[PDB]
């Protein structure tokens, strides 16, 4: 049963965003559900009344109802339980993604959008497969450390902390979220980090990613608003509304 | 190379062992007189502590298995098992493997945790819990960890929830729910920012600290005494003498102000402190001091899972955002929807002490990480 985890107070909001917190119940670890609180906050500052719904186990994803979809990281066990549930949501999420729906996926979330991921032990776990990437095994070793990337298409720099066993390998039709400046990012090759499909934003960044990078928070929420309310709309400037959150 | 002249109780779990153990001793001294225990922490080198009557040992999760080769305990007590920074279920099965070695023992568990539910051991199980009034089933807050039914694998709900994932749990598919409790906290009598008073199996006990997590420590202590046939009247007599182990509130007069200093370690701990100060009957200034290091947690991301969003419903005029990571905590505090104008980011701890000194409001709460608190505890001016 889907339920409304959060909502804006009543007020004078031009716009209306509906956020799907995919598996917020189970994928709640390492601070990364703070990303839900950052979207909400940023969306309110751009005149959106936010309504965050936990779409979780056994539920259905309404591809036509939601404007942003967030998919956090979780514990190994929880994540393999989720993996079994996912084929019910595959057609819905694919439609959402392909109709240019905005997504922010993190760690396990990111991995699970792809074809598969392999646990540290070596167990293969199938993902949605709405995307082309896979994530590979790393026995007894992690990519832990500070990290900085740059997305050449937005001339934007995102910073974070990474800590993951899996080694993600993007497909030919995917770009990374950015090129690595320092850190490991997606895999052993230290080239690319995360993903950027078409309004999908994957990453392994802890922080959480939207606290540390207000510029990505702004991009996600505006990309969503402009898609719903048309590209012509005029939103408060990045520097005007988020002045306090800018290094 | 050991003395087994002793009915012996071992106390393990991730949180609150020392308190539960220290309390259990004080209680049992009022029944058996001489109660044998071990100071601070202890692994296999507890023979030194040991060199008719009863002993109560604090044992480490890890070390347990080894020892249970040597000693043959009558009671195993698990206060609870939470994770820190797949690691819960392995330390549970580590303690559970030790307990197989001693099939004669009874195991006393926190019934309110789902993790303890039909343990795969032959031993007879006894449960303590908050047996409070059941409402209609509600989900726990989404950041609550460990909410899958241990049979159905589906999502648990709560007929009532104390804190974290503890309470009268129920899966609406499997049917699995919190088992019948053997030692019942039947009524939560009082609970403020400073005290809690509560009823367990006929008797009222109270602690002069507040915050609801501590009651579970008292419950475990009382439940042990009851398993050993102690009179509820003697339990109280000795409970009171040994209630010092919770400690007083650490309030400071700053000239004209009364400021209370409170520790935060982790999301569950922080939320617990927040829900405590929510109950204060007056307005106060909230200062949050965030440092990042070994002791305080190397990653500040944990504050994003702490339920600070509850401050908007409190009577708070001023906020200060201090400590080494002043910049990150101020952002956290903003994102609650608290008036951004009234959050005062503050480079230096001396400046925080001063803005409190010169505030117009009369009480001030300061939540701080371990080191931030030690630094601030340098009020080398007057304490
Ligand atoms: N928690 C994380 O940062 C990543 C989780 C992921 N399952 C891994 O490969 O480790």
Author numbering:
A (entry chain E): 1 to 247
B (entry chain A): 43 to 93, 104 to 137, 142 to 439
Article, verbatim:
The essentiality of murTgatD has been demonstrated in important pathogens such as Mycobacterium tuberculosis, S. pneumoniae, and S. aureus.
In this context, we present the structure of a MurT/GatD complex, from the human pathogen S. pneumoniae. The N-terminal region (1–42) of MurT was not visible although its presence was confirmed by mass spectrometry, indicating that this short segment is mobile. The most striking difference between the central domain of MurT and those of Mur ligases is the insertion of a cysteine-rich region (187–236) between β6 and β11. Although no glutamine was added for crystallization, this compound could have been trapped while the protein was produced in E. coli; glutamine was thus tentatively placed in the residual density observed in GatD active site. The conserved residues GDCys107, GDHis206, and GDAsp32 are in positions close to the Cys83-His193-Glu195 catalytic triad of the glutaminase of yeast IGP synthase37, identifying them as the probable catalytic residues.
